Design a protein around this ligand. Structure first.
Ligand SMILES: CCCCCCCCCCCCCCCCCC(=O)OC[C@H](COP(=O)([O-])OCC(O)COP(=O)([O-])OC[C@@H](COC(=O)CCCCCCCCCCCCCCCCC)OC(=O)CCCCCCCCCCCCCCCCC)OC(=O)CCCCCCCCCCCCCCCCC
Ligand SMILES: CCCCCCCCCCCCCCCCCC(=O)OC[C@H](COP(=O)([O-])OCC[N+](C)(C)C)OC(=O)CCCCCCCCCCCCCCCCC
Ligand SMILES: CCCCCCCCCCCCCCCCCC(=O)OC[C@H](COP(=O)(O)OCCN)OC(=O)CCCCCCCCCCCCCCCCC
Ligand SMILES: CCCCCCCCCCCCO[C@@H]1O[C@H](CO)[C@@H](O[C@H]2O[C@H](CO)[C@@H](O)[C@H](O)[C@H]2O)[C@H](O)[C@H]1O
Ligand SMILES: CCCCCCCCCCCCO[C@@H]1O[C@H](CO)[C@@H](O[C@H]2O[C@H](CO)[C@@H](O)[C@H](O)[C@H]2O)[C@H](O)[C@H]1O
Ligand SMILES: CCCCCCCCCCCCO[C@@H]1O[C@H](CO)[C@@H](O[C@H]2O[C@H](CO)[C@@H](O)[C@H](O)[C@H]2O)[C@H](O)[C@H]1O
Ligand SMILES: CCCCCCCCCCCCO[C@@H]1O[C@H](CO)[C@@H](O[C@H]2O[C@H](CO)[C@@H](O)[C@H](O)[C@H]2O)[C@H](O)[C@H]1O
Ligand SMILES: CCCCCCCCCCCCO[C@@H]1O[C@H](CO)[C@@H](O[C@H]2O[C@H](CO)[C@@H](O)[C@H](O)[C@H]2O)[C@H](O)[C@H]1O
Lengths: 126, 171, 63, 98, 459, 55, 170, 60, 51
């Protein structure tokens, strides 16, 4: 019985067939990843351990993340068949849906009240 | 980043801990622990590394099928019932710098000794930076490892936040 | 944090105790008005339509 | 590039004045600032203001309405009258169309 | 109202003639005294409003808004005096002058008897507000935020001016007492549809209605703390207060004209509440929370029932204090770490124990824990919209769940967990900061003991 | 170290439950209803440095 | 302390103690202790306070509002007459809210008092509650937040027109 | 500074005088025209709200 | 005192404002003791019913 990955349940690393077939080209890439991580670690630790520092060690990665998650969207937005259809589907559609739900409910209720078939015997708070 | 040997030894430790979770009773666990150790021993001297990798891959598939869905976890290990329990009590040492003078006055001996550590940190820092400069290749460090102090009177570079970290049971 | 709470406590009680004592004395040694029909030909002041002495004083003084 | 001053370092008010209330660098001004805020804010507005609200003379006539309702319910039930009528206004004063 | 207008004006000579080092002490003390005297507006009657003169009147709606307005001024001076410490003396006094002039316009706005007078003062508040944001905001984007704020308002308020003048030509008066008696029903026609929109859109943009709300998260992220406090606490309520008044003369057309705006609000509050769960900037999160809370007020005003009008009034007061608190709490973190990013500084309950209590209390009012006036207002609206249509309870109920999630998410992320290792400048809470927090929450919780005074004319 | 606060939260827990049990109207009952829920939140997340407790 | 006709109460019927046990009743002794330890000292303090009050007797009055012409007798747009008619209507509206509250209070007290026999023994209170709620609903329901005497009169005339129409076709 | 105040007040006084006179003239013209043309400003027949029919619009 | 004379500005603004509010009332007495609800006879020493 093979593992079937899903969006919310990743494939275990020990069952990943690419985990074992490791080439010299793949070891070279892993070494370069550890060099970037080590270079950033050193840059951080030099400020983190500095006895004269008091404040926040600004992290450009955090600044880039908060900037991307807001200000950078509209400049890189293109009106096309995808964003327009998603823009319409989840922008106007719910308002029209709820309009008909509530409008239909209220027309039915108002027609019964006028005909005197809605029980409002003790309804004096509104 | 894990060698073949490291992968095998990690599976052995992991498989035994899930076996212990199934067996529960010590005499029963001892019996099946020896049977499992025998299975690793039969292929101990495999030389054809292609076969060794296939044995490791098949073993991992076997572990996944037979793992305990609720294995035992040491209380303070990640996922344990006491993991991170005392983090709320861990306060960094720099917080003592903001104590009111009357608060510091209650521990005259502690804060006198604290000033000695701060003096030691201050006088050691420039040499720590220099040692890292002269020992680091041009393109920056390639690993996270740090060196010892080389001369006498020197301290290992970047020692403060390791030496002065909060106690595991700080209150 | 301890100092702020002491200061907050002190300034609340600074007027809080005089007011609490002042209300107790007023309720004991003055008391509330008692309901009565308007005597014929008498026009009460607007502050006389209220029961509690502090309420009457508020209406009389400010309102 | 241009001639611009460097960014100053943020100053911790507690360094010069460990007793600082955080209002002013001048200790005398700092203490007075704390006193007006605490006295006029808490002693006056909140304590006396809360007391003033507690004794508002029958705010919006709720108590008078209850007394008036009791008077009407007493008189109406004594005389065998309906406690309340559907008509707010006397029909004899109304001229319907057509 | 002259007993409040003149002493408010006198705050300006007081600030300019004070000793250099006593501008904050003097302006704070005397604006607290003005706030004290504002409790005399509680002389309200069961039938008639408090009609002072030909220009100004007070009733149970404007009175609570007046008291909130005058209370906020000393709180704003407390919140501002720290980040303005380096500012030179003359510019400090100009800042205080803008706050004072804002209060003067606001108290006149809420008591103006004539609607065109209300319009001019309603518009006048833009000028100082825009100056505060663009001149004393911190970042480059305050200039854009100033423009969006200015032109969103005027795009709606200019049509309101035409409608108001048109009404006076047709009716002969814009005095609100006169309109109470000379109001005539609004018949169906395309002319009346656009008269309705002209009468309402300006107030919708200020609330803000969902779809016209995009200016508000901008304004908050760029404003100084005092700007955020007055924006959230009072300036949003100019729309609600305006709608509560002008709906008098729009019946029965509101019966069907309100439908699109009820749909935008009912669905809008769930969208904005959901958006709060993913916001990365603390000020922006609080800003989106306001849009969701005010969507309830729009619905309440538009369905026009006694319960909905009482709930709308309580919500406006309750949100005013809560949102002002939340901005002040977020600002006190900003003054230490100089970033609005919510995930930057974590586990602050370990470092600032008492400030974490204020964070807890503010969050609990934001999610409307009973019996806070935040809950009373929300509940009264939920009760009245249920009669309007039983299906609304599903949308109202879902929003309550999402509101709790994002309120506690904000509390958990910033106050709990592990502290950030490298942030080593979290100095102890100042007396000023603690007093500022308590001057929000204490009146808020005290109002629970006598809620009637914030329930409005329909009480 | 915060045993005093712990016992205060247990007492507040008990008070909101008694409000719930003795309430004669739904608004009063709702006060106790939500009170016990919020006290549950504060006591379940007692060890707040732990992510699982906050979750 | 209050008018018994407005807030009626049946005559209370208490059974006499009729023990069928040799054990003493702990409630009897706690009642004696409570009367001695709690009630008597409380009564003494109150009697001291009532003596002080008797030295400073003063009065307050229930405001009387003379009747003025109602909205039916006001010429269109005559604000001076409309204002007095409108304020009177608002005062009556507040009074009618409290009359409903009195009847609801009677109903709720009957339900608790009659215990498990409340469904039968509270019929008169239930009937009175039903009638006043109907009368109140006719007057004031559906007027909206911007209610007035004008809107109330318009609603009544709509109801009158419906009643006349049905009566004709009969 | 004194002459600034005095100059403003002096000119302001006369401008206010003209302002009030122009509004008095407007009222004088309007009332005379209404007298001259009674047929265009008939005295309105006023009914009470008991006699006037207004539709009721329920808010439910 | 030259130190504390600025502290009278706002309190005097309130007194002046209070006084002008009362002056405003003297211009709105067209119906004093003339409303159908409250109109009555004057007491022997009374000149006006309110001011
Ligand atoms: C904070 C807000 C601040 C607002 C300003 C204060 C205003 C104010 O206090 O007015 C209100 C009220 C006073 O109102 P008032 O209009 O001045 O009274 C007029 C009477 O004629 C006055 O009555 P009196 O003439 O009988 O007064 C006599 C009394 C003197 O009474 C007082 O004056 C006390 C004033 C309290 C100080 C203000 C606080 O002196 C005594 O004899 C004390 C009796 C005990 C002796 C044994 O003060 C109180 O509320 C006292 C506290 C409440 C009484 C105790 C109730 C016990 C709890 C039972 C309910 C709860 C059950 C448990 C559930 C708990 C939840 C889980
Ligand atoms: C239990 C405690 C006893 C108790 O209930 O107290 C008695 C009362 C409530 O009980 P009460 O209503 O029965 O009144 C008691 C007095 N007698 C018996 C005469 C009626 O407490 C209060 O009323 C306090 C109300 C405080 C509200 C004002 C808060 C301060 C306002 C400051 C203004 C600035 C903030 C901004 C405001 C926003 C706009 C409004
Ligand atoms: C930007 C470029 C476009 C500029 C706007 C375009 C004009 C839009 C005009 C809408 C129609 C209003 C109108 O013309 O009505 C005229 C009519 C006057 O006729 P009257 O004899 O007085 O009364 C009987 C009615 N026939 O009846 C009326 O006078 C009633 C109209 C009252 C006043 C209307 C105010 C302007 C309405 C348009 C704006 C409404 C939408 C606002 C949206 C803002 C969103 C931020
Ligand atoms: C806790 C401090 C709170 C400070 C704010 C309140 C300050 C004012 C407190 C009330 C002062 C006394 O309140 C006032 O006393 C007298 C009673 O003697 C009342 O006066 C009434 O009774 C007295 C008899 O005693 C007679 O003059 C007369 O029958 C009548 O005027 C007033 O109607 C009442 O309002
Ligand atoms: C929340 C607290 C607010 C604090 C406000 C602080 C400012 C207080 C301003 C005080 C103004 C007092 O103003 C003055 O008071 C006296 C009381 O002797 C009143 O005195 C009058 O009250 C009524 C008026 O019908 C009558 O009984 C009688 O004419 C007289 O007693 C005056 O009508 C009023 O002109
Ligand atoms: C007839 C029309 C003209 C009407 C003029 C009426 C007012 C005339 C005021 C004349 C005196 C003005 O006073 C002049 O300005 C201010 C306030 O005093 C003073 O200087 C000021 O500096 C700072 C504020 O900036 C403060 O310390 C303090 O307010 C004061 O010392 C000057 O040292 C003084 O020379
Ligand atoms: C519906 C009722 C309310 C409608 C109100 C609409 C009126 C216009 C409001 C905004 C006016 C701001 O005026 C102008 O707008 C544009 C974007 O819109 C701003 O420009 C900003 O967005 C544009 C477009 O992404 C970017 O190229 C630019 O880098 C950025 O600064 C200008 O810097 C500003 O000067
Ligand atoms: C009804 C109105 C209520 C308004 C309330 C306003 C509160 C204002 C608080 C003012 C704080 C006191 O302000 C300050 O007090 C002291 C003593 O009086 C003055 O005088 C001071 O001068 C010097 C200090 O340099 C010393 O001699 C001594 O410290 C003191 O005498 C200061 O010159 C004044 O700046």
């Amino acid at each position: 019985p093979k593992y079937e990955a899903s969006r919310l349940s990743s494939l275990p690393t020990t069952l990943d067939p690419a985990e074992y077939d490791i080439s010299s080209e793949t070891r070279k890439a892993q070494a370069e990843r550890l060099a970037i991580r080590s270079r950033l670690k050193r840059e951080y630790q030099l400020q983190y351990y500095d006895p004269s520092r008091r404040g926040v060690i600004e992290d450009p990665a955090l600044v880039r993340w908060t900037y991307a998650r807001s200000a950078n969207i509209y400049p890189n937005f293109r009106p096309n068949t995808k964003t327009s259809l998603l823009g319409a589907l989840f922008g106007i559609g719910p308002l029209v849906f709820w309009y008909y739900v509530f409008k239909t409910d209220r027309d039915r209720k108002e027609k019964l009240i006028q005909e005197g078939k809605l029980d409002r015997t003790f309804n004096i708070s509104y | 980043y894990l060698t073949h040997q490291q992968k095998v030894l990690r599976l052995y430790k992991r498989a035994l801990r899930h076996l212990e979770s199934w067996c529960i009773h010590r005499d029963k666990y001892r019996y099946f622990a020896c049977l499992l150790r025998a299975r690793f021993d039969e292929h101990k001297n495999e030389k054809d590394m292609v076969k060794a990798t296939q044995l490791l891959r098949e073993a991992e598939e076997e572990f996944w099928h037979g793992q305990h869905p609720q294995p035992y976890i040491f209380p303070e290990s990640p996922g344990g019932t006491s993991y991170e329990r005392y983090e709320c009590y861990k306060v960094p040492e720099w917080c003592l710098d903001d104590w009111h003078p009357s608060e510091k006055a209650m521990y005259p001996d502690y804060f006198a000794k604290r000033e000695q550590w701060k003096k030691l940190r201050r006088e050691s820092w420039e040499r720590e930076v220099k040692q890292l400069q002269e020992e680091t290749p041009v393109g920056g460090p390639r690993t996270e490892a740090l060196p010892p102090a080389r001369k006498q009177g020197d301290l290992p570079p970047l020692w403060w936040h390791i030496v002065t970290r909060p106690r595991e049971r700080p209150m | 944090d301890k100092r702020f709470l002491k200061l907050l406590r002190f300034y609340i009680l600074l007027t809080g105790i005089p007011v609490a004592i002042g209300i107790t004395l007023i309720n004991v040694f003055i008391g509330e008005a008692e309901l009565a029909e308007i005597p014929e030909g008498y026009v009460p002041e607007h502050w006389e339509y209220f029961k509690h002495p502090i309420s009457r004083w508020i209406a009389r003084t400010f309102f | 590039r241009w001639q611009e001053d460097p960014e100053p370092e943020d100053e911790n008010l507690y360094e010069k004045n460990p007793d600082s209330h955080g209002y002013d660098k001048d200790p005398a001004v700092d203490i007075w600032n704390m006193r007006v805020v605490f006295f006029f804010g808490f002693s006056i507005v909140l304590v006396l203001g809360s007391t003033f609200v507690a004794y508002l003379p029958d705010y919006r006539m709720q108590e008078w309405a209850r007394r008036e309702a009791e008077r009407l319910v007493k008189y109406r039930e004594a005389h065998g009258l309906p406690i309340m009528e559907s008509n707010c206004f006397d029909p004899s004063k109304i001229q319907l169309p057509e | 109202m002259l007993k409040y207008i003149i002493p408010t004006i006198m705050l300006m000579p007081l600030t300019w003639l004070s000793k250099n080092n006593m501008i904050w002490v003097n302006s704070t003390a005397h604006s607290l005294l003005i706030s004290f005297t504002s409790l005399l507006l509680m002389n309200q009657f069961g039938d008639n409003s408090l009609n002072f003169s030909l220009l100004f009147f007070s009733d149970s709606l404007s009175t609570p808004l007046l008291i909130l307005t005058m209370w906020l001024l000393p709180l704003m001076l407390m919140a501002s005096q720290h980040h303005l410490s380096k500012e030179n003396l003359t510019r400090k006094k100009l800042f205080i002058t803008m706050l004072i002039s804002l209060q003067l316009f606001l108290i006149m706005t809420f008591t103006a008897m004539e609607l065109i007078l209300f319009y001019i003062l309603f518009e006048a508040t833009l000028v100082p507000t825009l100056i505060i944001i663009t001149r004393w905001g911190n970042q480059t984007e305050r200039l854009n935020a100033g423009l969006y704020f200015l032109f969103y308002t005027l795009a709606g308020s200019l049509p309101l001016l035409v409608a108001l003048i048109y009404i006076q030509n047709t009716v002969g008066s814009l005095n609100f007492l006169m309109l109470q008696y000379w109001v005539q029903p609004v018949h169906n026609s395309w002319s009346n549809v656009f008269m309705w929109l002209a009468c309402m859109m300006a107030f919708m943009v200020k609330m803000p209605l969902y779809g016209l709300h995009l200016w508000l998260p901008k304004a908050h992220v760029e404003a100084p703390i005092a700007g955020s406090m007055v924006l959230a606490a009072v300036l949003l309520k100019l729309g609600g207060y305006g709608m509560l008044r002008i709906t008098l003369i729009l019946n029965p057309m509101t019966d069907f004209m309100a439908y699109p705006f009820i749909m935008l609000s009912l669905w809008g509050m769930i969208m904005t509440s959901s958006i709060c769960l993913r916001q990365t900037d603390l000020k922006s999160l609080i800003a989106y929370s306001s849009v969701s809370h005010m969507a309830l007020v729009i619905v309440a005003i538009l369905i026009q029932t006694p319960w909905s009008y009482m709930g709308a009034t309580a919500l406006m007061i309750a949100h005013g204090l809560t949102s002002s608190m939340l901005f002040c709490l977020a600002n006190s973190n900003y003054e230490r770490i100089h970033s609005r990013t919510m995930i930057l500084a974590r586990g602050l309950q370990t470092l600032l124990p008492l400030m974490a209590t204020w964070w807890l209390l503010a969050s609990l009012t934001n999610l409307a824990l009973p019996p806070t006036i935040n809950l009373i207002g929300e509940l009264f609206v939920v009760m009245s919209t249920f009669s309007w249509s039983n299906i609304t309870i599903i949308l109202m109920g879902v929003n309550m769940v999402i509101t709790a999630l994002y309120s506690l998410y904000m509390l958990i992320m910033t106050q709990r967990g592990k502290y950030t290792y490298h942030i080593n400048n979290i100095s102890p809470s100042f007396t000023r900061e603690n007093a500022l927090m308590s001057l929000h929450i204490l009146p808020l919780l005290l109002l629970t003991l006598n809620p009637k005074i914030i329930l409005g004319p329909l009480y | 170290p915060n045993i005093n606060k712990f016992f205060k939260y247990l007492l507040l827990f008990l008070i909101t439950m008694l409000i719930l049990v003795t309430a004669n109207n739904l608004f009063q009952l709702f006060i106790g209803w939500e009170g016990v829920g919020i006290m549950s939140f504060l006591l379940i997340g007692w060890w707040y440095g732990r992510a699982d407790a906050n979750t | 302390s209050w008018d018994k006709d407005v807030y009626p109460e049946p005559p209370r019927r208490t059974p006499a103690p009729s023990p069928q046990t040799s054990l003493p009743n702990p409630i009897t002794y706690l009642t004696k202790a409570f009367d001695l330890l709690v009630d008597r000292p409380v009564t003494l303090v109150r009697e001291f306070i009532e003596r002080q009050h008797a030295k400073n007797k003063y009065y307050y009055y229930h405001r009387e509002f003379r009747r003025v012409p109602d909205i039916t007798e006001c010429q269109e747009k005559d604000v001076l007459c409309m204002f007095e008619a409108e304020m009177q209507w608002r005062r009556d509206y507040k009074v009618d809210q409290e009359i409903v509250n009195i009847i609801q209070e009677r109903l709720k007290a009957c339900q608790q008092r009659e215990g498990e026999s409340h469904r039968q023994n509270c019929a008169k209170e239930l009937e009175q509650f039903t009638q006043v709620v109907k009368a109140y609903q006719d007057r004031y329901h559906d007027l909206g937040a911007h209610y007035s005497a004008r809107k109330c009169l318009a609603k009544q005339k709509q109801r009158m027109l419906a009643e006349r129409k049905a009566a004709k076709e009969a | 500074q004194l002459l600034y105040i005095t100059s403003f007040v002096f000119v302001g006084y006369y401008l206010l005088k003209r302002q009030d006179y122009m509004y008095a003239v407007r009222d004088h013209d309007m009332f005379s025209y209404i007298k001259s043309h009674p047929e265009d400003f008939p005295e309105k027949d006023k009914k009470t709200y008991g006699e006037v029919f207004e539709e009721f619009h329920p808010v439910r | 005192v030259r130190d504390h004379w600025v502290h009278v500005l706002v309190p005097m603004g309130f007194v002046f404002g209070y006084y002008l509010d009362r002056k405003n009332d003297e211009k709105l007495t067209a119906f004093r003791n003339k409303s159908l609800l409250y109109k009555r006879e004057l007491k022997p020493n009374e000149e006006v019913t309110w001011k």
